[model samples]
Target: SMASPQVTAADIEDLHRRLLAGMAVLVLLQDGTRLQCILHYNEADSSLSISCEDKVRVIPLSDIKALLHTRDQLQRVETKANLVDDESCVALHLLESGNCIPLRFDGVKDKTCFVDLLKKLKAAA
Candidate 1:
């Protein structure tokens, strides 16, 4: 139901570049759980590592069902404006069960940048 972009084999390498950049993000879970963590891409294992609360959890790409774009912000600082909108935050739909993982960035620019790479990976997935 979605268009998958044509990509070169080299794109995988490029995808890792941004993913491995090591960024702090807020993770919103399906059951109203929140995690503040540093995300890292593990290309060698084709997985993601989230370091939070002095602990690390590794999730493989194969376990993801889909990646979704969301506009939810962890922090609401802006004044109210009519007909205003927000930028991209991402949610990971897990294939395992009912749990979903959503990543929220600090700023719109960071969200946009991360979303771009995330969509590419979704297409490739």
Candidate 2:
């Protein structure tokens, strides 16, 4: 899935605005040495809290080294059983490059769910 051809930054911004409302965001910071928790953002006091957790874990987004969510950043891999061997081989090669993963949606009916999933994935990164 190359991402919805029509999806745009503006659309994401709009979605964010609608979802965030006026509440402040919670920021999670990871330690620089290891992927450990460093700080957390508190909306009420507008302060950052430091903390840590055991085990190699998926700390909140702030703790992640890098995060990429834009459609343009996610490489699109197209796979088709009907594609010619050469084309299929090329597609497989692209997939191996760690560019992007392909996904398909039926229609707008599931758009909300898909967008929510993407948001969670991004925030969890």
Candidate 3:
């Protein structure tokens, strides 16, 4: 029930500023929802904004765990790409009906990844 030495406002500002151009990010929502999104910032807004599923949403500086960004490229996994790695994969899917479903692969295997899946998913090439 306490916060000690949390990230300063300036620190968060710098973080948002770094995304000026654009960058794909993974957002963990307050409702226990996960969204793969792209974030952009400007002088007008101090916070970062994300685009996902054709919807643009502003992400509060708080309520964020981390903004995973790659210096060279974005990172994304097969499971993250929604293609499934193997049948044994475990995916936590959130449904609008308020049911959280954890999906597991029934039969699949031998997956390989050379780059960050987020980048890969965003790249889609």
Candidate 4:
């Protein structure tokens, strides 16, 4: 099994510094079990927010478990999945297992990739 990335307090401090300067970060929850949306800091409240097509979810610093980005070793998988699809079902399962976010697919462009990603996540968890 792959170990979770070891991020130090100093690393988080540096991340906050860059984040305050307008860096966008991709967060992976539960070791890739779910891909939370891109989150950027809100200097005013010092909180993080993720924007989806319909809503923006504000998550406090304390709620975050891990942070990632495009450069991470984790692969990006696309899915033809939806809320009513199997991916959603798997997401719900993860949520029940204490995951708070849902993995993101590239908006239905690549089903195979997304399915593979979900499978990998399942195995990892």
- Top candidate (TM-score): 1
Off by over 4 Å in 3: 1-18, 30-33, 59-125
Give residue 61's error in model 3 in angstroms.
Answer: 6.5
> How close to the true structure is residue 13 of candidate 4, measured as C-alpha lDDT?
58
How much lDDT does each candidate structure score?
A: 0.61, 0.31, 0.37, 0.39
Error of 3 at 98 (Å): 21
Clashing pairs in 2: 1-102, 30-63
Q: State, as a TM-score between 0 and 1, how close model 1 is to the true structure.
A: 0.61
Q: Quote the lDDT for 115 in model 3.
A: 17
Please say which candidate is ahead in lDDT: 2 or 3. 3
Question: Worst lDDT window (10 residues) for model 2?
Answer: 85-94
Task: Give the per-residue lDDT digits (tens) of candidate 4, residues 1-125.
Answer: 68644444555455455445544323335443334355456756545566644457776544544322222212232333233233212121222223444434333322223334323333444
Query: Residue-wise lDDT of candidate 1 within 24-103, one digit each (tens)?
Result: 87766545466789988776777787888898988887887666554433223222221114443566666887355666
Residue range with the least summed lDDT across 10 consecutive positions in model 1: 75-84
Candidate 3, residues 5-55: lDDT per residue as tens digits?
A: 544445444444445776555544434456666666443544446677899
Q: What are the clash counts of all predictions, listed in order? A: 0, 2, 10, 1
Candidates in order, TM-scores: namely 0.61, 0.22, 0.31, 0.32
Best by lDDT: 1
TM-score for candidate 3, residues paired by index: 0.31
| lDDT head-to-head 3 vs 4, winner | 4
